[PDB]
Each structure stands twice: as structure tokens, then as C-alpha cells.
Design an enzyme around this catalytic site. Sequence first.
Site, PDB file in Angstrom:
ATOM      1  N   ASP B  97      13.659  -1.701  -2.515  1.00  0.00           N
ATOM      2  CA  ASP B  97      13.766  -1.581  -1.077  1.00  0.00           C
ATOM      3  C   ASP B  97      15.049  -2.186  -0.555  1.00  0.00           C
ATOM      4  O   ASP B  97      15.344  -2.035   0.631  1.00  0.00           O
ATOM      5  CB  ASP B  97      12.562  -2.236  -0.393  1.00  0.00           C
ATOM      6  CG  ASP B  97      11.329  -1.373  -0.452  1.00  0.00           C
ATOM      7  OD1 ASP B  97      11.470  -0.141  -0.338  1.00  0.00           O
ATOM      8  OD2 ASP B  97      10.221  -1.910  -0.633  1.00  0.00           O
TER       9      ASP B  97
HETATM   10  N1  LIG Z   1      -3.882  -9.115  -2.273  1.00  0.00           N
HETATM   11  C1  LIG Z   1      -3.347  -8.458  -1.220  1.00  0.00           C
HETATM   12  N2  LIG Z   1      -2.138  -7.855  -1.362  1.00  0.00           N
HETATM   13  C2  LIG Z   1      -1.568  -7.188  -0.335  1.00  0.00           C
HETATM   14  C3  LIG Z   1      -2.296  -7.130   0.939  1.00  0.00           C
HETATM   15  N3  LIG Z   1      -1.539  -6.419   1.790  1.00  0.00           N
HETATM   16  C4  LIG Z   1      -0.421  -6.053   1.123  1.00  0.00           C
HETATM   17  N4  LIG Z   1      -0.439  -6.503  -0.144  1.00  0.00           N
HETATM   18  C5  LIG Z   1       0.653  -6.260  -1.117  1.00  0.00           C
HETATM   19  O1  LIG Z   1       1.760  -5.737  -0.381  1.00  0.00           O
HETATM   20  C6  LIG Z   1       2.217  -4.478  -0.874  1.00  0.00           C
HETATM   21  C7  LIG Z   1       2.090  -3.459   0.252  1.00  0.00           C
HETATM   22  O2  LIG Z   1       2.628  -2.190  -0.110  1.00  0.00           O
HETATM   23  P1  LIG Z   1       2.771  -1.055   1.023  1.00  0.00           P
HETATM   24  O3  LIG Z   1       1.631  -1.283   2.138  1.00  0.00           O
HETATM   25  O4  LIG Z   1       4.099  -1.167   1.667  1.00  0.00           O
HETATM   26  C8  LIG Z   1       2.595   0.602   0.305  1.00  0.00           C
HETATM   27  P2  LIG Z   1       4.205   1.398   0.066  1.00  0.00           P
HETATM   28  O5  LIG Z   1       4.056   2.850   0.297  1.00  0.00           O
HETATM   29  O6  LIG Z   1       5.261   0.801   1.124  1.00  0.00           O
HETATM   30  O7  LIG Z   1       4.747   1.145  -1.428  1.00  0.00           O
HETATM   31  P3  LIG Z   1       6.177   1.731  -1.880  1.00  0.00           P
HETATM   32  O8  LIG Z   1       6.020   3.232  -1.818  1.00  0.00           O
HETATM   33  O9  LIG Z   1       6.379   1.188  -3.274  1.00  0.00           O
HETATM   34  O10 LIG Z   1       7.115   1.153  -0.850  1.00  0.00           O
HETATM   35  C9  LIG Z   1       1.364  -4.153  -2.086  1.00  0.00           C
HETATM   36  O11 LIG Z   1       2.160  -4.261  -3.268  1.00  0.00           O
HETATM   37  C10 LIG Z   1       0.275  -5.202  -2.136  1.00  0.00           C
HETATM   38  O12 LIG Z   1       0.265  -5.787  -3.439  1.00  0.00           O
HETATM   39  C11 LIG Z   1      -3.607  -7.812   1.013  1.00  0.00           C
HETATM   40  O13 LIG Z   1      -4.278  -7.801   2.066  1.00  0.00           O
HETATM   41  N5  LIG Z   1      -4.052  -8.436  -0.078  1.00  0.00           N
END
Ligand SMILES: Nc1nc2c(ncn2[C@@H]2O[C@H](COP(=O)(O)CP(=O)(O)OP(=O)(O)O)[C@@H](O)[C@H]2O)c(=O)[nH]1
Lengths: 114, 114, 172, 1458, 69
Positions: B97
Site C-alpha cells: 500500500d
Molecule cells: N483481529 C482483527 N483484525 C482486524 C480487524 N479489523 C481489521 N483487521 C485487520 O486489518 C486488515 C483489514 O483489511 P481490509 O479491511 O483493508 C481488506 P482490503 O481489501 O483493504 O485488503 P487488500 O485488498 O489487501 O488491501 C486485515 O488484514 C485484518 O487482519 C478486527 O476487528 N480484528
Amino acid sequence: KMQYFLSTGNLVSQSGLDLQQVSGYTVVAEKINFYRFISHFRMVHRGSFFAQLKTTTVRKLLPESWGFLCPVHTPDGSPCGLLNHFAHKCRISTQQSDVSRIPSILYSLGVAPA
Amino acid sequence: VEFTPTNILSILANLTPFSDFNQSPRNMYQCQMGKQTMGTPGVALCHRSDNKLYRLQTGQTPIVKANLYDDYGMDNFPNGFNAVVAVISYTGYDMDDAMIINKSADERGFGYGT
Amino acid sequence: SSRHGQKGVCSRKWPTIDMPFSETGIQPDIIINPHAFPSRMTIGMFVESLAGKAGALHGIAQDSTPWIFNEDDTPADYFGEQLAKAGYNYHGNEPMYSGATGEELRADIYVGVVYYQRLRHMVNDKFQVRSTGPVNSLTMQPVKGRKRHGGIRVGEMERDALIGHGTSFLLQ
Amino acid sequence: MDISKPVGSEITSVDFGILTAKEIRNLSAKQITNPTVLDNLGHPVSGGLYDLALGAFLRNLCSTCGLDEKFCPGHQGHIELPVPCYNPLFFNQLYIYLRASCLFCHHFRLKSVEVHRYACKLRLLQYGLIDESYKLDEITDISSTLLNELKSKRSEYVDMAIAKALSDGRTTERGSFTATVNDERKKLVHEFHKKLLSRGKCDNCGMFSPKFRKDGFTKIFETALNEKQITNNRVKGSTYILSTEVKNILDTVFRKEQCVLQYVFHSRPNLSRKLVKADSFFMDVLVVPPTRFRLPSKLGEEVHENSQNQLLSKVLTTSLLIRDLNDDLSKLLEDRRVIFSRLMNAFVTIQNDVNAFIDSTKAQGVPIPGVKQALEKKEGLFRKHMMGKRVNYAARSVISPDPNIETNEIGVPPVFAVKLTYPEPVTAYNIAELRQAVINGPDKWPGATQIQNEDGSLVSLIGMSVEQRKALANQLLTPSSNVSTHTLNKKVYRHIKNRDVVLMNRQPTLHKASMMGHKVRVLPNEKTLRLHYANTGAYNADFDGDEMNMHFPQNENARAEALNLANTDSQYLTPTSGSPVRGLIQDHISAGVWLTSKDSFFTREQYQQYIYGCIRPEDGHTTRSKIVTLPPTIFKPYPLWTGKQIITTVLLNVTPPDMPGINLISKNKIKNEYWGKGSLENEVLFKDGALLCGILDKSQYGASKYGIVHSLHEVYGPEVAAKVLSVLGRLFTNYITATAFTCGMDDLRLTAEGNKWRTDILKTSVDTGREAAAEVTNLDKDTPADDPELLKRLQEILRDNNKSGILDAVTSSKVNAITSQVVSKCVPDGTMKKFPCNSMQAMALSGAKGSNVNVSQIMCLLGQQALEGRRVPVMVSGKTLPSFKPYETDAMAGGYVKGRFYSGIKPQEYYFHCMAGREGLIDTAVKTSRSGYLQRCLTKQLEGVHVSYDNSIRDADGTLVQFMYGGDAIDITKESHMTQFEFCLDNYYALLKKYNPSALIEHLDVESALKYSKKTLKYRKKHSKEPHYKQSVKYDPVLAKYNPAKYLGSVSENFQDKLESFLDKNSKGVNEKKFRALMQLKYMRSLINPGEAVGIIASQSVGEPSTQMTLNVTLGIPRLREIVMTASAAIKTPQMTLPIWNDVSDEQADTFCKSISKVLLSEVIDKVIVTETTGARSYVIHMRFFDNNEYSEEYDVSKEELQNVISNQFIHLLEAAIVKEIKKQKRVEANNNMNKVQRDRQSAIISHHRFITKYNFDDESGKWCEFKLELAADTEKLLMVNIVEEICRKSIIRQIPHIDRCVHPEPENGKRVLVTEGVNFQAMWDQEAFIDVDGITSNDVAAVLKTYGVEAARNTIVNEINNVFSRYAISVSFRHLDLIADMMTRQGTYLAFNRQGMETSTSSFMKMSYETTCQFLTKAVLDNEREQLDSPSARIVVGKLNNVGTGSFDVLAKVPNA
Amino acid sequence: MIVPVRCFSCGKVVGDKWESYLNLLQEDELDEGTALSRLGLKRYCCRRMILTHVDLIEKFLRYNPLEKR
DNA sequence: GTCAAGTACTTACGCCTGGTCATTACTAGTACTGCC
DNA sequence: GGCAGTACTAGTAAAGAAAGTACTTGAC
RNA sequence: AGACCAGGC
Ligand SMILES: Nc1nc2c(ncn2[C@@H]2O[C@H](COP(=O)(O)CP(=O)(O)OP(=O)(O)O)[C@@H](O)[C@H]2O)c(=O)[nH]1
Ligand SMILES: [Mg+2]
Ligand SMILES: [Zn+2]
Ligand SMILES: [Zn+2]
Ligand SMILES: [Zn+2]
């Protein structure tokens, strides 16, 4: 006692209102941005009772919110589906409109009185 | 019939440009992150005494903007800057990113804030 | 961030003589990876690049309120024919060179201006150190908090992740 | 911790007991008595809660030890409760013995020979004599001559049984206590208490005792003994009772029955021989904690006293009230009348105060938290401050990516390089570099911040100048001027250098590779941790603002583990599947498509620039100290090197010389059709280390099995394969900054022919939503969209949940067929720019970033937007949105969008797509609280399970889970190329250098295990035509008779069968015997090591792939909730699979499932018309069926069978429901003379049943049935239609018990399958003629436990946990599934991973730490349970080294002299 | 806030061209495309400085605490 | 003895960063002042 | 000049929308 | 140290 309600958000009521939640009614207006500041005045919230709840069907994007609630402007994470914002032309009534001549003109349209 | 199909979206939802070309979660992320930017909160900062306040120095108006941008007076509150953006794998430091800035861009004041 | 959910931290303020440069002489002051686009499908950022560059050339602003374009008048055709009347490429590309080796790159690099946003999440509000410091009076364990010079927590899920390596002196 | 301050003793065990009041008057510092905490001018008053005898308080010396705040440990005192009050931890167990005891003879109300029967069974269970306690029931109105003799035979049997087992090497005099004798002890005490409480009379002297009433807590009431049974009290020759009276009763009961409760209150034999007393249930003295542990809540001036002081003040206020209430009893009728009613009121409130101090929820009264609630939950004491702790010497900052870091390093900022420090003790070899470290000072890197002297003194360098600081550098290595510190040396807290070690860690740490050990390389510029891209696949760490922790270990035992054991080079393969997780990601994979292309030619200046840009011999990446090159591919006209040949000489310099090049035949993700006609670039070909063919891709380098980097990991080792990722990380970075990669708007366009293709298949979709609707609604042929019969039934479909579910599944199925026709045509064929130039398409075929479904939605068609299985939800009105008309049969109206992200989506295509986008974010965010608690329940039971040195994996207390890990004892991270024989044959001479067969013959046995491997292979090929129950086996497998880590050739049977199958098919200078003698040493080296924390690995191999699901059978994470966590015998959807014999055909199967599938009486009735006439309540129940030509074809229910259900099954339930309601409200046809056999049939029903006065059935057509039903006039109105409906849905025509339906699906994977929707094995054993009864598998793992045994439920739980990861194509290896099975079936039952499945366990600190702490605490102290500190949870509470991995052995030192 | 000296991409001096641009839009009735070309701003990185400057310092300057009002 | 249902207690992802507010009534007392 | 009324003061006392087992009480 | 609110991944 009204400065206490605004500074904390706690609802102290001896004859508790028609509301499920008892805390979290006021929120600091940030002015961290102007996009942030104007978004405080267009947000709707369902209630903090519904936040601490493990259902999904209350957080859904329903088709009845066409033009009333915004589809996309909703936070990610825990408030997702619960805190959301109005469409920008959705305005809320704030005064009792004139009603007193409407039964007088419904009887002439064929309504038999009660 | 509706007056316009954009009166269903909110304030911040109408200001993301070409919103119908993004995926749906990425329009939902911009309404979250657009109200977290370092922009200009006001112009009365000499008379404010808020305990924390972010202010980007030289904002710009966007080339690519909705017609609702100039209608809510968002030119009074610039929240960013137009940047010459190349979509290129050149560096090796910007894969997942991440992203890089020209060094001599913000030796000149690109994106500076207090 | 951009106005399309393309967030990301800064890696290195890359020097101007090491950046790529076009035939017009400019250099891009932001590089974004082309791999941030296919999984995310933010095609609105590709078309802000055409619309941004075709507006700075002619000195005009373009409205971008949604559903002003149909499927028959694509904005790749609208902002493409504006870039052709300026003398630039229809597809938004420019011939660029490397800053390190000074060679002609293979394909014409896709550039244009978009409107970025600086978020309030700096490193200085993040970034906590601790060697030692204040402890809690009840347990003589370090204090919670960055501003109180406290420590980070090795919780339960980190504990058995140290069991799973079989390392037993890291856990103690 | 100072390594130069050793500690002498060690806590080996703990045990739980109760403070008696005599101890806590001798233990005490000072009895505290007045309820005022501190007086004016802030002084703690003498005798109060803050006293100087209970510890130093606020710059005032202690009165007990005389030390200040920093050195006083704190001292306990006590208060004097005047009345013996209830301890609320033991009130539930007091109230059992408060009841069940005779108030006259002070025994229990059982007979005294049966109470003795438990005392002699529980004495046997104190020792390890679980078998002999069942032989003791074999020792067997009634005179006391023989009952005195029966107690002698049972007691002499125990005294003979204990003495024999203690001499037959089985039980120590401290008693054997394991997990499965804790099962039969808790089972026997719960049999004992349940039988004590169920007594009417005392069976010693036969008269009643007045029963007791527990109002709640704080009180106790004896009830009124009735007038019927006070006669028994007269032939033997309500009231709040005081807490002083209950202690008076139970002190007498525990002396008449001491000889039983020594064994009820002790798990291990009572060696101290102490009495158990009823005073131990009460508490007469509260222990006030030391004033260190109840310091006031200081915040500026807002000083509030602690919450315990506010609770202990109320106990002292009540204790002085009752002292001033008993001062009137010394003065002494009305003065006695009112002073006692207020004294008994003070008895309740001092109990209500001692409740609130211990437990805030047992206190009637927002309340102040008690001692129990500082321990219980998250934010307790076990979970918040014992299992997890805040740590010193640890950092956290945002991460930015960094190449040019050698992939086993972390890039640390200067600002962590200055604060983080490490104690080096000074020696003769450090005073070169550590004298310059102290001179540099606390701010110059590399420097030092503190010197620890020999004396324990500590000198800071912060406020010092450089001239003072050079004086301390020469004083640094000096001999000691003290005798008592002569063997110690100074420790210099140097800064972190380029040689230290660091733990990096990102939350959530869902598996163990999310917390690795990196080397450190400082960087001089900014404040962020800097990570290489090969680590991003294991931490799951993008760079959109991730911050991740950094822990710096402080001794050499932990530096040696985070470099060798938890190292990041060791973690190339994850132990979930054995698949790799480390590899290059996004730009490096798209570069290798261009660099290894046939078009890539490099001249000599370019060729030698790319090699030195990635090798750089002075940093030791080469193995030759001189870069060797290759001759060019093309000599004339001018030399050129193909880009295949770049990686050939990359893989030539980083590889060890005099070890041959790698041989590798694999394929990649790009087909040959994307290159051209006749290309061979799909298969890759490394021959003698030279890339001769094919593109290197994600499948070659990257997180992918059997690539080139995964094959470098096997042939050359893990240190080589981590170096090749560093070199290919730099070679593909410098190739990008000279030959770059971009994507644009140009890459998203189709041709004019491709758009013409797209808009003509999408014209077929305009009638699909009507053709799909007319199928589901069963309208005939080509019906219009506005047909009023069509619109009628679509409204009927909408109001029902399941009918709308099969409209949204048929219509979705047809529009995804239109979607696939667009994608199969318009891409790659209709795309304007094509591969390799089409960069959007190039990085999806290569797997760099993206998918084929992603470029489908950009370039062709966004698709059907699907909700939770269904389409877009519909309003009440039938509109799916206000834009569409109600109930239109358009595919666009139900969520199928036709726009694309290139051209744009319409405003109602936009809104439907907003519904699916939010749904994916709700299931991502708020639904991972269900997978994260799956993993917590797994890791608590399996934290101590580990490989022993027996090669026999077992629990921490010693009980045995399996006899061998997976049946073959091999590691998942080593069995990758174990059966890859054609790989290992081509690389024989290079794999022989790392296993080295002839050098390892000496320390091994080669002769013995190979003979018995031939005596069982030859025996089994002769046998094994018969099935498994017939096999007289006569020979164990060779892996259970011999140790596979010591004997060469002790392999598993399918490794022996697959080796000889490879070594027979293709017979191919290495001969046949050298190849099988190298696989047998490779197998032996692929053995699992003793000490591997396997149960943690097996619990992280399920909880982390369960988060690949988030973030008519149940499926996914609710299925794992039923199997693993709850162990539900009331499973939500039980099934049973019935194999059809091959003799019977498909027409003899679907006519057979009608006999099994149940038929209700509801399923045969058209309508029922009651006719209530009154003025004698007369109900004419006329029930109208379907035609006999209609229900005897659907359900095959005959006419005569339907009459008997009405006669013998329906009316017996209907009459029972009418009498139930009458009790609870006291607060066309011909005549009847057809035949006498209908008159006799009528006359029986009037005779048998209660108030039926007429009955007739349609005996000629079966269409109607009509029976009169009469009531009196006293009864008021019954509904009698809601009665009949709710009885007609319960009365069954033809039911097999516990089976509701029998379905014949399509034959999946060859075999014929007949699935029922219930479990009944006993009834499916009569259907031998249709069903293979030896192949009836099932779904209900508790029912196959009940009928097929322990091992068949063990096999069923593996198959049910296998096919929950098979729907998602997640491969977790069968060894993790093996151990979760064998832990859940370890007692012969089906135990869950919850607090009911862990009650049978020895470790009490494991059970206290998990949940319900002070319910496992009371059970531990009422057992007087000693625990040997075995579980990792119990060793972290008390602070031991963990018994797994490194702490699974001791280290001894051979001193040379005597 | 105030006009940027020395534009962010190449480094051309731009900060002297704000008061001429508002002169070349109001007095000389030109569009924005011709006025950016007359001031010598050819590269489109230089053109988007004067085209998109907000000049928000004029809204700041009306809060002067050093004079009565 | 007995099945029976009602009732009671029990858990519900990890880590991190900010910010705010926080006892109230009353009751008896010493002192202030208006008064004659 | 000193008495009593109020107005304060500082003083010490009260504060309605999740799913699992274990258990007693409960008719018969 | 709590409660609430606003957030980060
Ligand atoms: N244990 C938790 N981990 C979380 C939580 N919210 C987010 N995360 C972590 O944050 C990350 C969130 O990823 P995203 O919501 O941005 C999905 P995205 O499409 O942006 O992934 P990319 O396509 O790789 O950018 C993910 O790796 C999770 O491991 C939560 O409530 N609990
Ligand atoms: Mg991230
Ligand atoms: Zn002391
Ligand atoms: Zn008795
Ligand atoms: Zn410029």
C-alpha cells in the site's frame, strides 16, 4: 444538570424515557476537518443497545432507504450499518403542519365519518 | 421522477469523483478517510483554543470535482492538493500500500502542515 | 490518500535526480503502484488522472458528479479527446525515462494529476519506545499508555505463539 | 532479571487449603478495629485500615519491619468478626451438608453402612486404584450383627488392596492421581451428594429432620415439620436460624462422620492426618490485605480511598454496632423485646458485608467490585496480568517497506537504536568494542546508557560529560575490591547493534509465524520499522498504516532461541499444510514475467550490471569471491544474453560450488496460449541449475509449493533459500528501476469487436428473469411478464421465506450462465491491448496482484450482486427498489448488474452493489468474534500437548494423547519432498551432500529394522485381500516396534508402499539400492523432534485457516462450533448416508425412500370443519382428506392404515389435549345402516375413548371422516380448531423414529448415496436388502459413539472436520485433525473444548485461568488439590520455565576435578 | 494559504504570478487557459499551481487582533 | 424413583491511540446584619 | 448598645430484542 | 485505575 448531560451524554431520568439506551447521547464535534465537522450534523444512530448485539439483520442496507439514508457513507468496523448519514436533500420536519382543514375536505371526497 | 440521481448520496458521498467507477468498499473507505484528513478547520484559529488542531498549510481546489463541491462552499476549506501521480513500478518501495514522494517536492512545501 | 480509498504510508522521500522524468521535463511527485488497482478496482482514480491532466492543460475544471456519463460516451473517450487536442496521448500515457540509468522505459508511463489528501495519522502520534520506566503499583508491571512512557502488551495470543515455536526462554 | 544474581530454591508444587482462624491471629501484624481510615492532617490512625503496622504508607515508616515505602513488602492484619459468618465461596457446598444431615443423632440421613461404602471407595481413588473400587461392590429388617461384619470385609479388602499396589510398584504412599481417576472421583462425589440430599428419614434412627430453605444468600430458614410426621418423633422412646447454630450442628456432624469426609475433602492421601472441620466452611476472622495492595486512588488532588477500604469500612462499622448492641444484654421486658430484633438484624448485615467484600454479586443492594471480580474475566487478574503482561525493552512503530535488507533482518530506526539497550558483562574480548561503546555515551550510536557495577549498583551515563565518561571506561575492567563480589564483572548496557536479535510481532498473531525473530540492521534516517516483502505474507501486513511490535530479548538464552529456533529462516514452511508462506509479492512477480521472457536480451554492459547489482561479493552473497559468468546466447552479430540466463548465473553464484546444480520440472500460472502458437513457456525447466524453459512466476518464487525457491529450500537448505529471495528481491528491483512496469486506462478497453460481443450476449439477459420466474411459479409456456396468474403467485412466493429462496437460486443460476458467456468470449479474445502488453491482464494471470474475476468486473461485466445466499431483498410491496414496478420479472431489478467498472454502473446498479459491499464488511468485522473464540477454546486444552522423547505425543501432566504423531512421527514442515521421488532422484548427488549416508552409519542401527520391514511387507502383500476384521495380523508395523529416529528403515507403511511403487514402475549413475537407502535416511531426518509444541500448532492450524472463511447441512464456522466447541448431541442437522447395493436399481430406491420418510396426518388432510352446537357442548369434527387416488400415490398411505391412525393414534392425543385445557380453565353422505361392521367399529370407539359418541369413516372412498365429540355445560369455550391443528401436526401416519426424510441425491464421485435427515441405526439394520449396512456412515458424532464405539466416533470427527475445510479448498493436514480428535475422545466419551470438557483435568491453574475462576478455585480448595505445575498456564502463574521445547530437558556441566 | 513560491514538481518560480493572473482574468477578459499561457506557464505541473490556488490568506487576514473594529 | 420444565449462571477476536468527566443533599453551625 | 433573623458555610452522610449446562422444584 | 466517546490495523 443540563451542562452535565451535554458534557457526559448520560441520561439521568427518574421516569425513564421511551429510549433503550441510557448513555452516549452527546458527542464532541471535532473540527478536525470541515468534512468531519459537517458530518456530525448529518449522522443518524440506531442506539447503543444495538451495537452490543451479535445480530446482522439490523446492520443491513435496506432498499427502503432510497434517498433518505446514504448507502456508502457509513464507517467500517463496529459501527458499520448502525451509524449512517442522510442523503443531502433529505430534510427532517420540525414543526406540526396544518391539519385542521383536511377532515373537512375528506368528507367531501367520500369518507364516511367515524 | 427524481430531480437528480445524486440526491441519494450524502455530502461526502457526492464529493468523491467518479464514484460509480470504484468498487463499493472503496467508496465507503473514502467517506471515512475524507473526514480524517489534515485540511483547514477554519480561519478563526487565532480566536480558537481547542486542545488539538491540525492544519495543512497550502491547500488547493481540485481539478476534478463535483458540482456539489462549489455549492456547499468547500473552497472555503481546502483539504488537499493536486499531485502529479505516476502509476508506475519504478521504485521497489511502494508495493503493498506504500507510496513515495519526490524529495524535492516537500523540500518546497508539498503537503506541509502544522 | 486519494479520493478513492487508496491509502498508504510514505516509504522514502525519493530524490528528484533518481525519479523518472517525462519528455515534457516534469517529474511525478507521487508514485503509486499499479498493483493497488486490480484487487481494489478503483477505476475512478484512473479516470481522475485523465480528467485531472486534461483540465490543467486547458485551464478548465470538469464536473465529476456521478452518472453524467452513459455507457455510450465513456469518459475515457471524453477526456481522451481532450488530451489529443493538447498534443498528449489519448490513453493518458507519457514517454518517461529512468532517473538512475537514464534509459528509455519500455511502455509509455501512465501519469496525470489527481487530488490527494494528507491524513492526520502521522508517525509522531504513533511510535512508542520503552527500555524501562514507570510501573503499576499493584503488580509492578509496566504502565498502559504511550504518553505515560508505558509498555506494549504481550497478551494471551502472543503467549502461546511463543509456545508454538518451542522457545521457552523467550516466554520467560 | 540479572543473570549475575542467581536464585537458589524453586517452587516445585503448590496446593490449596483454607486459612483457619488460629493461623490468621498468629500470622497477623495488628488487629484493626475502627472504621475510620485516616484522620485530619492525613495521618493513618492507629488501628484503622491504614495502619503503620500493616505497611509503610505515604512517606511514613512501617511499624513492623521499620522499612520505608520501597522496601516494605506489606503486612497482613485481621479483624475480629463477632459471629461466625458464611464464606460465600463455600455456601453452596455448606448447604449440601447443612441439609442431608440428621438433627437428632448427627449422622447423615443415609444408613451408616452405605456412607461407609463411599469412604472405602474414595480411599481407593486417592491411590491409583480405579479398578479395585468397582470390585468393592462385589463384597455384599437387617440386624447389625452382619452390617458390623460387612464393614469389616469392605475395610479389610481396601487394606489388602492398598498394601498390594504399593508393593507391586504401582502407587507411592503419596498416592497416584491422574486425569482419568479425577473423572471417577468427581463422578463418585456427585453420586454421593445427590444421594445424601434425597432422604426422608435418618436410616440410623428412623425419624425426620425439619427441612431447610435457602432464601438466597445471607440467610437460612428451617421449614415447618408437618403434623403427619411428628408422630415418629413421639414413638422414638419459617424460623431464621442463626449462623452460630449452623456451626453448632455441623461441628457435631463432622465428628460423628469424620471417617468419611477425610476422603471427600482430599484428592491425594492425607499425609498430615489433619481433621476436616466445619469451622473451615465458615469464617470468623477476615484477613485485611496489606496496605501496599490497597493504596488510595491518587489523581492530583482527587484522592479517593480504594474500593476495598470502602467495603472493609462497612464491616467494621457493623462490627462496632453489634458490639454496642450486645452492651444492652449486659444491662438486662421491652428493653429486651426491641434490642434482640435489631441484634438479629445486625447478624444479617454483617453477613451481607462479608458477602460484598468477597463477591459483589452475592450482595443484595453500581455496586463496588469484590475480591472475586478482580479475578474473573478479561480484565481480571489471570487473563489481564498473568497470561498477558506489559513488558519492558519493547518497541512499537509504523512499518514502511524496505528492500536492500537481507530478508532475515528488521530495519530499526535510530530512535529505537538509542533507547533500547542490552546488558553485556565485560570480559577480555569486549574491552575493545565495549570501551568505545561507553565512551560514545547514551546518545551516540553505537553507544551505552548505563553501567551496572559488580555490587549491583547502577551508574547512569545520561548527565555526564565526555571527560568524566573516559574515566569510567578505564575503570570498566578492574579487579574487584570486595571479596564477596570477586567472581562478578561489570555489565555495560550497550545500545542495540547490527548483531542483536529482535522479535517482530503483528496483531492478531493468529499463528506462530506471525511472531518471528529477525536480525537487526540500523538505518540512519527516520522513525519507522522497515520490513522486507518476504515477511509480509506471514504477518499479513500491508503498508496502509500497520504498526507492529518489536521485542528485544535481554539474555543469551533468548538470543540463541530467536536466532535458531523462532528464527525467520526456519519459518519458510508453515506447519498448517507444509506450504510456504515466504516469498516475493507484487512488483517482483510482474518483473520476472518480463525478465524471463523470450524477448528479453541483454548486452554485456547490461548483463554484468544486473549481476553485481544483486550479488555484491563483499557482503558475502557469493560463494566464490569472484563473480563467474556464462558465454552469451547469441555470439554474432553482437553478444546478447537472454533473460533466462540472468537467473542461471544468479543461481550459480549464490549456490555452493562442488555441489551440482538443481534439477526441477514444474509449471507456472500462464498458459501456452497466451504466448503464441507452439510455445512451451508453461513448463519450467531447471537442468544443472540452468533455466532452460518457461517463465518464473508466483508459482516459482512466492508463497507456492514446488517452485524453484521451495526446491532450493529442500536441496540446499533454509539458509540458501532465504538468500535467493534476497538476491531475486534485488535483481528484480534493479531491473524495475531500469525497465519499468505500469498500468493505465489503455489496459482496460475492449475492441470494437469485443464490445459488440459483450452487448449481444447481454441482450439475451433481458428475458432471463421472466424465464426463470415462470419455471419456479410453474406457469406453462412463454407467459408474459404482466400475466395476472404470474403476478399472483410471485406475491405468494414473496411472503414465504423458502419459496423466495428458490426463486433467488434458480434466477441467480441462469444469470451467472449469461455472465460466464461474456467472460469466456470477451477476454482474452476481445481485449484491445493483449498479453504481455496488457498490464492489467498480465498481473492477474501471473498472480502478482488480482484475479480473473477482478478483470472480469472491470472489463466485461460486474455480475450478480448476491446477499447472504439470496438476491437483493424485496420490500413489502414487491418492489425491490422504488425505481422498479412491483413484482417485475427483470434480472436487473433483482441485483444482476450489466454495467462494468470501466464504463460505469447505473444508479440502481450502484445501490444494489452498495448492499453487497456493506455485507462483506459486516461479516469481516463483527463475525470474527466467532472464529477468535474457536481458537481460544482450542489452545487452552492443547497448550501442554507436546512430543515426548518416547516419540509419543502426550499432555503436560503425563497422560497420553497419541502413541505417535500422526501415526508416522514426521513434521509437516519436512514432509514436502518426502514422496516427491522423481525430484529427489534427479537431485540425488546434491541431496546426498546434506544427508550424507556413509558418515552416519556409525551412530545407528541399519541391520535390524530393515529385516522386519521385509517380514511385514511380504506378509501384508500375501494377505490384505480380506477386510480388516478378518486379519489375524501376527505382525506389528515396523514403526511401533522400532524407534524411527534411531533405526534406519523404520518407516510408515504407505511410505514403504509408495517407495517400492516408484521403484518398480520406472526403472532407470545411481542404481536402485542407493536410492532407497537415501529416502530412508531422508525419512529418518524428517522425523519430528521431541519437544515440539504440537497441540498449539494443531490449534493454530485450525483457528488461523478458520479466518480464511471470514475477515441443507450446516457449514463453516457454525459447523466447527458444533463439533469442536460444544460437542452437541443435539446436532442442528443430523444426517446419515446409506450406500445402495449394486443389485437394486434407481427405481427400487426412490420407491424405498417413501417407506422411510415420515408421513404426518397433517400431510393428508385438505380441510377440517368443526361444528360446535350448544343448546351439552357438541363438536362435529369433520375432517376432509385428499382423494384416495391422490394421497395413496404421493405417500402410498392406504385407506385402512389411515383409519387406524384416526382410531388409535389421533384421538388418544386429541382427548389428552382437551382434558389438559379443561383442567387449566378452572382458574351429502348416506345413512348409518350400510353394514353392522361399521356399527361395531363405531361402538368400540365410544366404548374405549372418553367422550366420543359417534364415529364413521369413508370405507368406500377414504375421502371423509366425521366423529362427534360431547362436553358438559360446566366447561367454557375451547377453541377446538387450534387444538385439532396442533394434534394433526403431531399424529404420525408412518414414522421411523428419529428419521424425518429420506432423499436420493445424484451419485457423487461414483458411489450410490441415499441420505436421510435423521439418525436411527437400529432401524436401518432391518433394511439389508437395499442398504449396505457395513457402509452406513453418519453425521451425528454422538450417535456413532453410542452404537459403533469410541474409535468410530474418532473417525467420524476427523471426517466431519475435514469436509468443513473442503468446501473452502483449505488444506490442513491430517495430523492436526488427528490430535484434535484424540484429545476429544481421550476418556472414551465425546468431550468438548469448553469448561465442561476440561473439568476432568489435573492442572487447576489451567482451569482457573480459562473461565469461571472462582468456581474452579472452590473445587480446587475443597479437594485440597496439589498440582505439580505441569501445564504452561500453571508455570506462568508461579513463574517456572515452560516444560515444552527448550525447557523439556536440563543442562548439566562436566566439571573436570573431583 | 498564500501563493506557493517555486512549484512542487519542477521548481519553476510561480509565486510572482498570482497577482498578474487575477489582473489577466478581470481587467483583460481572458479565460484561464490563455492567461496561464501568457504568464509563461507551459508545463501542466506549473499550470495547476495558479489555476488551483485558493488564496485563503485573504480570509485569514480579516481577523486582526491588533486593530479595533 | 421418576421424567419433567423452570430457573440460574455462564461465556461472546487481538492489539494500539486520543479525549472527557468524576457526590450530592442537607444539616447544623458560626457569622453577618437588621433591629430597637 | 446587644438581640434574633437570614444567608451562608463547611460539614459529614447516601447514591427494553443472543445460545449452552446445572440445578432445584415439580406432578405423578 | 474506571465509565463513556472518538478512532487505527
Ligand atoms: N483481529 C482483527 N483484525 C482486524 C480487524 N479489523 C481489521 N483487521 C485487520 O486489518 C486488515 C483489514 O483489511 P481490509 O479491511 O483493508 C481488506 P482490503 O481489501 O483493504 O485488503 P487488500 O485488498 O489487501 O488491501 C486485515 O488484514 C485484518 O487482519 C478486527 O476487528 N480484528
Ligand atoms: Mg494493513
Ligand atoms: Zn513493614
Ligand atoms: Zn438420626
Ligand atoms: Zn512545474
